[PDB]
Design a protein around this ligand. Sequence first.
Ligand SMILES: Nc1ncnc2c1ncn2[C@@H]1O[C@H](COP(=O)(O)OP(=O)(O)OP(=O)(O)O)[C@@H](O)[C@H]1O
Ligand SMILES: Nc1ncnc2c1ncn2[C@@H]1O[C@H](COP(=O)(O)OP(=O)(O)O)[C@@H](O)[C@H]1O
Ligand SMILES: [Mg+2]
Ligand SMILES: [Mg+2]
Lengths: 72, 121, 177, 140, 70, 208, 104, 52, 141, 52
Amino acid sequence: APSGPFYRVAGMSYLRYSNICADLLRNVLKEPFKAKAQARQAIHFRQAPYVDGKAGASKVYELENGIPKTAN
Amino acid sequence: SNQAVKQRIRAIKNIGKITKAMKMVAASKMKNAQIAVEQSRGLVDPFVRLFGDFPAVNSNKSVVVAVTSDKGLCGGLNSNITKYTRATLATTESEGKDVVVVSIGDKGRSQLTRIESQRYQ
Amino acid sequence: EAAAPAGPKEFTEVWNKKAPSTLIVPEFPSNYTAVKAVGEGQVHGDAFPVNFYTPHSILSQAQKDTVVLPGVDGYFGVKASHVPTIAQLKPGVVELHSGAESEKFFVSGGFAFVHPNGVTDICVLEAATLDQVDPAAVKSALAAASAAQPTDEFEQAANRAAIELYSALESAVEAKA
Amino acid sequence: VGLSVSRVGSAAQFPGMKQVAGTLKLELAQYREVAAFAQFGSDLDAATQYVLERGARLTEMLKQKQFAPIPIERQTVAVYAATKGFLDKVRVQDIVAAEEAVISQVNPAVFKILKANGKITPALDAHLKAELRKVKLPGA
Amino acid sequence: VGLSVSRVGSAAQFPGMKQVAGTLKLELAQYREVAAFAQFGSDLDAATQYVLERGARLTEMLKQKQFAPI
Amino acid sequence: ATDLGGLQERITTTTKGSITSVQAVYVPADDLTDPAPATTFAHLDATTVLSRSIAELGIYPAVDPLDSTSRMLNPNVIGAEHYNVARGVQKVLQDYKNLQDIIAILGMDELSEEDKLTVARARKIQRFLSQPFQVAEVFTGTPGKYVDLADTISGFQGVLTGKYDDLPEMAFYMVGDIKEVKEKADKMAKDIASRKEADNKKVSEELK
Amino acid sequence: SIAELGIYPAVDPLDSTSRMLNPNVIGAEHYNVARGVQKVLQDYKNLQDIIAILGMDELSEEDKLTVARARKIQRFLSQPFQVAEVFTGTPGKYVDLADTISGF
Amino acid sequence: ILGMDELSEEDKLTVARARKIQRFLSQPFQVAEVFTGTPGKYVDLADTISGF
Amino acid sequence: LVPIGRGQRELIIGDRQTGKTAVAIDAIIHQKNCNEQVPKAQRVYCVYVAVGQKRSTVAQLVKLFTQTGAMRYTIMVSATASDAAPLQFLAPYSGCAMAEYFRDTGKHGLIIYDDLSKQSVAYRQMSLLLRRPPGREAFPG
Amino acid sequence: EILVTGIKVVDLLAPYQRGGKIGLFGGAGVGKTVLIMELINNVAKAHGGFSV
Ligand SMILES: Nc1ncnc2c1ncn2[C@@H]1O[C@H](COP(=O)(O)OP(=O)(O)OP(=O)(O)O)[C@@H](O)[C@H]1O
Ligand SMILES: Nc1ncnc2c1ncn2[C@@H]1O[C@H](COP(=O)(O)OP(=O)(O)O)[C@@H](O)[C@H]1O
Ligand SMILES: [Mg+2]
Ligand SMILES: [Mg+2]
């Protein structure tokens, strides 16, 4: 449907595109410096849609390999 | 009779060991996480230099997030911004507009779903 | 038209009516930034303040005389008073110059502003100096990238990003001066 | 340890113990002030975790089974093997072999010289430090 | 309830009550074992909270008036 | 017990006359378990235990609401509406007493939002039990307040239901009725506006 | 306080002592599982001070394991009695000696 | 819990003062000089006040 | 929760004005509701022993028993606070002997020794004045 | 029968019987003479009989 850059027409937001390029730079570093890469790459949080003001939902992320490059 | 006050003294004595250990745990964490906050302060500067800072804008839809804590021994932090949430939320919403209230940290999901439950998504 | 002037010192007037006086006025991020864009200055010659940033690291806040940025329409240099520019950057080498010296960070993307008061800001997400990259992993990654082409458009958007970043990194390590 | 006193003190103890147990009771006293930090997960200033792992292996140096008293020269070596830093920094699954392995593998001449002199001389701790590093425990 | 014991237990109460007061006696103990953890209020995995709404509905069951025995 | 019981059994209402006796009982070193106050407790219809720690808060009369009892506090004697707001006032004051050491060693920041309403209401009714006396007006200066019975039952319905969560805690302190807390909550906000009132200058009086 | 958790027989596992608790009498494998149980039960008694302040969620799974094991051991020291079936309802159990050493 | 580095200027002059006040509260004794070598000092009150 | 039995001794213990008499009064009131219902031999004959109480509390309690009809099955022994110390000492035994008539003849009794903590104080007064040597809290041995 | 005293904590939580025994338990300086003088001030003037 939409227009814009190649990520934006593929449903990919800018924050996911610029993070996919970000960790792909971190994957090819030297091992003294790649040790400091998966520290700031790991995503560890959980979310819950509150559709009612009453209860939550689910969706928990334990990704230590970065932002999901797969579809969403 | 006289043993109840003796082992209650044992209760308060090592609570004074717990909360003195916990204060240094939080002081070591505040020390090493202080330099990460100094680094991230740089990148917020080019955007208010470029896009400005316009709080009192008229919208039809607005997402307000409240960044609270997760564990709750912080003592007057997560309650203070839920005062500052509604002090900021009500002063900007008089146009009959939509509002989504989000919280980061589950001390807000215990605190904001009873003061703003209709707008908590 | 400018008939609706929002702002930080104008937020206080609506906030002294509906919000109680028990709470002091909430802070705003402009109260922590000394440097702005529309108030002129900061050049006074041939140097201009350059602020190179990742979200995790302030890489420079010094004053340089030439900044070479990898824009999406190609590399471009920024001298002392460049035209005000919001330039989207592609994967490439940000090159800082103060004189005879040069530091070459390879960035992953992310914009670069030049402001009407001559200040400039480079806003990237990952900036690796080229001596922190080993080239043996780079060509084995582009060969892993430009081979597998799934028909899902979310992956070929990620594949084009992998192709564009690893190619510019390969040419960044063969272009030693 | 904090409540047990000796008013005679170190003036009536073994001189080979007096130079070794002087730092033993200080590092056990540091361990008592950091005793609440032992139950924590969020580590502290590895200057306090240095106390906490060394102190908690110093208390195991003072455990002892019933109706088996130890000669004094075998105690001063086993406290030398914990106060001078020869501690079980190996992952401490292997306690049953390595606990008694000091006095059983270190050769018995260093107990005869320590008993007859009553003191770890400079000519002896160099062989104590030589003997302490060649502890075999090869089943582990 | 945590301090009031009886030496007889069974065979000295109503047999109909003995079927329904057995699941009252321990279920009030599950109410008291967690009431010393009602200051944090995180009420995890909906178990230490579920006994709170049922344990509070059993103590209000036993409240009764004066000079009106049932 | 038989000396005190010999004296206290003579003070009764008989069929030919009533004695409404009010006795002050001294507890000897603030020990209510001392054998002379403990013996007297069984001889009375209404005990009003006064507390040294309530008086150190400044609440006068220093009556412990969770230690004072009466045989009249029965719904078949005083009516069910007066009785129910007495037992609800004693319910939230006991719930505030159960929180008294969590609020001490952890502060009010860690209570629930339904227990911070318990604390704020019970901190209001223990100021609203306070009252100025017509015999204490000499040494306190404030005039005494006689409160009628229906003004107390209706006033303590309101702090329990939540009709006066707006008002500050100190507006309830040392006032007679629930009318007087509203007329003191105004005066506490007339007074913080009176800092900006006027600049008092005394002019030209040296020759008058 | 053992009985008020509903654990019966309400034996304090620490305050109980015997002359037979000796590896020269009952053997070194009966002895070490007795001392191993009292070690994890004393460790749980020293952790319940900080659990009521924190919540037993940050103990980093070496003291979450010694809580989870000691809480199983407190229940596994309880036992139905044959003389107590007439007021609790469940039939009593005789446990043999080898069947409680290997079970613990 | 924080460190000697971030102490204030008027809060680390007192630390440099109180550290040498408490050194100058110590004193060698004449009765202890028979086994410690350093001779003992009798300090008058006029020299104690001005010295502090 | 705490089920009583027919020959069982059950203590009602608490502080002052916690409802100890009220539990025992509700027992006696409830037996009158059951005695008009059971066949003639499961009837329970209550005895209230009022030791050390004031005399107006006892009359306030007889008034509750005759207006309930519980006074048809109830004996009330009352050695009040004005009575001599050997009368309050002896009134639990006087009331138990009256209640043992029903136990020894095939019927069922229910005795309430209200303030058995006040019998021991009356017995302590006798023993200290017979110059028997005192013990814990000056009680007799 | 109730005896109203005009005191909020007395009329609400522990009401006084019109012909009953009333105790004011106190610990030297807590106010049980000021309370008993206020009861003289409040109920003795409204009483029709004789005070002692
Ligand atoms: N179930 C109940 N519901 C409501 N009120 C009750 C209940 N039980 C007792 N009360 C009230 O509690 C007060 C104290 O009760 P009671 O006199 O039975 O206790 P007590 O301990 O025997 O007193 P004392 O110590 O004076 O002998 C009484 O005024 C009574 O009306
Ligand atoms: N209702 C009250 N209002 C103000 N102050 C009071 C009140 N009751 C007592 N006080 C203070 O408490 C003190 C004790 O008074 P008093 O009743 O004479 O002592 P006691 O209770 O020991 O007989 C008085 O000096 C008075 O200052
Ligand atoms: Mg009674
Ligand atoms: Mg007086």
